[PDB]
Amino acid sequence: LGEKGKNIKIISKIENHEGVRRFDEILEASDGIMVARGDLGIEIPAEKVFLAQKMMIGRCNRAGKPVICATQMLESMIKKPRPTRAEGSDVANAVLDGADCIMLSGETAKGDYPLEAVRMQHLIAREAEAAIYHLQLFEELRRLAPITSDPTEATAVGAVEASFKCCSGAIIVLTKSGRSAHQVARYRPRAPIIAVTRNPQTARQAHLYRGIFPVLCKDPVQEAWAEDVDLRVNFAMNVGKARGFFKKGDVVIVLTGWRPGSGFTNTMRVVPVP
């Protein structure tokens, strides 16, 4: 990929026994992981795939790195407009395991019901997201995450804590590279993370992370930086209102930084929706 592709995310597909055995070193070198269950289920005994899936999702959640669950999730939908009960289960459990992304292959590439397959993944994901036991999940993520001096990590954990306490309709994050929004996603809030960015690649790459709902701000740069920041916050308020994530008077969490540029997110505000 070279210097020219240095910002392209590398997702390593784990496809065989070696990839599973050398998982930690692969994870550290990658931007994220795909649980490539198709080949994996040929490479290792089929009855062991759920072990490798839950191991990799767990380790990725622990690392704060995107994990994709892939292959045969709604396979019967290639030919039928409804999934089997095993398929509905599989989708729901991938989300409950903690997968950032779910995938469709033949269901959308060649099948008779691509839109029904997409819609079904949407319906299941959202049902499964409400069924997450956040109380245990957030306790465990906190207990297992290193104490660091990183102000952004501390702000991002503060934001998720606050979002649970006030039952917020969203966490609004201004981000240039996506990193601040990724850091929130790692702590798995219930509320959507509205990531406001002017970077179109950032907006696209943010879909790798659970709960990151990216919004691409097109509005021109306001004169006062504080006003340009407030403009982007207000943009996210407008998106949330339009999408029905929240209404006027509801509280949201807002993450910003103390100066322009990447790497300065250190401000968390609990704000009413105007």
Partner: protein
């Protein structure tokens, strides 16, 4: 009563399971990203517009099959469909493009 909030408040995982409720509706927001492999069923601009509306976040291109010309056209169609919604910035959804390599294989 909404988004399994009764289950949310349980002191044990077992009680959490006991409280899962088919009559507790989810919130509007969906957090899990949806990746769709694009191929002949899903390649047209018109189908891709509906894929996006239905919740597609990432368009996967599988490089086991197809020419660069074929893939370049798919990518063009993805971008055409995506940008048809650019007129309203409030409602515009970003759509990513993923390249899935053939990798080392046997044929």
């Amino acid at each position: 009563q909404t988004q399994q909030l009764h289950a949310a408040m349980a002191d044990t995982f077992l009680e959490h399971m006991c409280r899962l409720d088919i009559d507790s509706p989810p919130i509007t927001a969906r957090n899990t990203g949806i990746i769709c492999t694009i191929g002949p069923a899903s390649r047209s601009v018109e189908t891709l517009k509906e894929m996006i509306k239905s919740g597609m976040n990432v368009a996967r291109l599988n490089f086991s099959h197809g020419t660069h010309e074929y893939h370049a056209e798919t990518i063009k169609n993805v971008r055409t469909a995506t940008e048809s919604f650019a007129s309203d910035p409030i409602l515009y959804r970003p759509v990513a493009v993923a390249l899935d390599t053939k990798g080392p294989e046997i044929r």
